[PDB]
Amino acid sequence: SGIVPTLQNIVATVTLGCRLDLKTVALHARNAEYNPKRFAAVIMRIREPKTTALIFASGKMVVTGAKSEDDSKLASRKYARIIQKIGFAAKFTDFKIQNIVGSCDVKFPIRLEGLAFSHGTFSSYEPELFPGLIYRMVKPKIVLLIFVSGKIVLTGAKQREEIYQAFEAIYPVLSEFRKM
Amino acid sequence: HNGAPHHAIEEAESLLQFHVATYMDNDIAGQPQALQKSGRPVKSIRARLKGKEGRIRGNLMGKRVDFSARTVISGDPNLELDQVGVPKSIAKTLTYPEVVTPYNIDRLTQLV
């Protein structure tokens, strides 16, 4: 065991607590994107940290695309200021971790069919559909996306250890349903 | 009790009446037969008794009994007119209950 499921992404929503002018942000801001016919969301991205700001008409701004919690936070604080840089009285309010997407590798194929027959209470392999396996640990509430290549993808989390602590309790089962 | 759409009541009433009817007699003339999930109609009570192996003629006026046997017969001119040659294996099976008296107690002891 002892494999850290590296967070492949971290999501975070921050509310500006205001109401911008969506056309105004499109014309004035530089790293901004917003299309009415598709979805009324401002597509704002900053090069450092490289995340995306899912800014809606109601000031709900989502920070996605970082790999760590604070990068998804640091980008947000930059995100709010650049909105303030437009000329609005935006405010960095209501920051929260939304989701932590993460994957790992075990370097050995796993008997997911073995995982499914004994741990079918917990396993789900769809070789015809999904080359991984969905192993949802209740405590912590983490889903282990368990691939035949060994890719154990973990997400549905806002706690960094929750991804980590769940794996430490699941590797022996993969060694149970391993080949070599 | 739960509201009376006044003429679904008859639609269910006649149903109940029909059910009881065919239950006591599945052979009402000018009727459907209450079938049972198989095509075979239901064996109402009345048909449980109808003649020729109803209860009466089949289980009361005549039944099937123990202590009996059945076989092919064969003539024999060395049997007294009233005798009958029951084959040994049969006699090994049919029995007759004697009562132990001083007259037979020894013999019965030998038998047992």
Partner: protein, 138 residues
């Protein structure tokens, strides 16, 4: 979900795609539903079977099928990209056997018959030719 449950329990091999060709399920909500249903039934309480079905669908004889059987049996122990959704591995084992033989069922017919990739077969065949060492019974 329950149909695949019944087939697996009675040892019947059935493709999600076959089941979906029976029923419009969108296959993704189907995946989630089968997952949850399997978990429910596990609370309430082996991939070789697919070979002969496709052997029949392609019209293949029984010795060919048993050659494929032994190939698939060794497939589990021949990681080195063994299975990763082993339906592809089964179909490539079939392709190995037909190429070992002289059967005019060239990849086009088998692919269009089994709704499989014309390229994943050769992707498997790449490692299959190296793997050829551990596949000769007689």
């Amino acid at each position: 979900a329950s149909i695949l449950i019944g087939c697996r329990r009675a040892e019947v091999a059935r493709t999600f795609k076959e089941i979906q060709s029976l029923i419009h399920v969108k296959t993704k909500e189907f995946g989630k539903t089968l997952n949850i249903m399997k978990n429910i039934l596990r609370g309430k309480s082996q991939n070789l079977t697919y070979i002969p079905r496709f052997c029949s669908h392609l019209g293949l004889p029984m010795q060919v099928t048993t050659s494929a059987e032994y190939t698939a049996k060794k497939c589990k122990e021949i990681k080195e990209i063994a299975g990763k959704s082993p339906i592809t591995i089964a179909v490539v084992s079939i392709y190995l056997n037909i190429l070992l033989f002289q059967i005019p069922i060239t990849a086009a017919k088998v692919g269009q018959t089994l709704q499989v990739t014309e390229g994943t077969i050769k992707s498997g065949y790449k490692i299959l030719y190296e793997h050829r060492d551990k596949l000769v019974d007689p």
